[PDB]
Write a protein that binds this ligand. Structure first.
Ligand SMILES: CC(C)COc1cccc(-c2nc3cc(C(N)=[NH2+])ccc3[nH]2)c1[O-]
Ligand SMILES: [Ca+2]
Ligand SMILES: [Cl-]
Length: 223
């Protein structure tokens, strides 16, 4: 997260770290056995780390669970990142409490101007790599579709939305991918891509979760 602040230990209880010997992507807990992340964060050998604050120190509250299966969206396109969503089923359910809790899926899509919270352990510099030990937070508004398409002409599908600041300085970045964009307490986006990090006129692009609620529900129900 570039230009964000320290969240505070466990103030984002649905945030998870996908780990394969190091943190590589974020994700969101939606129920005690399922996590939603981005399809491009897929790989085998994933360990889901819940209740984390400092990812390099066991401080207590952590629950490390292996993934039983990862379900990448069947229409995911690695070239355009269209349908960039994935569900991971956990080997055992997580114990939910105030430090580990799930987030709700939306009932409607959010409008431009809606303020949301983005979090993650991704890079904090737009030029060079500086990865933090604790969770960073950023409050960013959803941008209008016209500003998003003007910024990325020909690359935004109806399953993507832009959120951020056109002046630069605040944005999600590498290491944040797969993580949550929460607005009015609902999971509205998944960190997907952007051009560099916090560059002027190049806001972040997020998977539009409201277009996938029936898919998530039908897929969790049949697995
Ligand atoms: C399969 C993963 C291990 C590789 O992940 C990645 C490798 C290189 C870059 C990214 C990445 N850049 C990103 C930029 C942004 C942004 N809003 N500007 C957001 C997420 C990003 N994720 C990223 O998620
Ligand atoms: Ca830790
Ligand atoms: Cl266009």
């Amino acid at each position: 997260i570039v230009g964000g602040y320290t969240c505070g230990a466990n103030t984002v209880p649905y945030q998870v770290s996908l780990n394969s010997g190091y943190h590589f992507c974020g994700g969101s807990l939606i129920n005690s056995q399922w996590v939603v992340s981005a399809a491009h964060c897929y790989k085998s050998g994933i360990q889901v780390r819940l209740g984390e604050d400092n990812i390099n120190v066991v401080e207590g509250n952590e629950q490390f669970i292996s993934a039983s299966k990862s379900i990448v969206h069947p229409s995911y396109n690695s070239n355009t990142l269209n349908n960039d969503i994935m569900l991971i089923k956990l080997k055992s359910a997580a114990s939910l409490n105030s430090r580990v809790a799930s987030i709700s899926l939306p009932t409607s899509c959010a409008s431009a101007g809606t303020q949301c919270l983005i979090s993650g352990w991704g890079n904090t510099k737009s030029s060079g790599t500086s990865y933090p030990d604790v969770l960073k937070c950023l409050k960013a508004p959803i941008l209008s579709d016209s500003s998003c398409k003007s910024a990325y002409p020909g690359q935004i599908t109806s399953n993507m939305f832009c959120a951020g600041y056109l002046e630069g300085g605040k944005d999600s970045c590498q290491g944040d991918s797969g993580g949550p964009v929460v607005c009015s307490g609902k999971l509205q986006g998944i960190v997907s891509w952007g051009s560099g990090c916090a560059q002027k006129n190049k806001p972040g692009v997020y998977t539009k979760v409201c277009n996938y609620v029936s898919w998530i529900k039908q897929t969790i129900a049949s697995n």
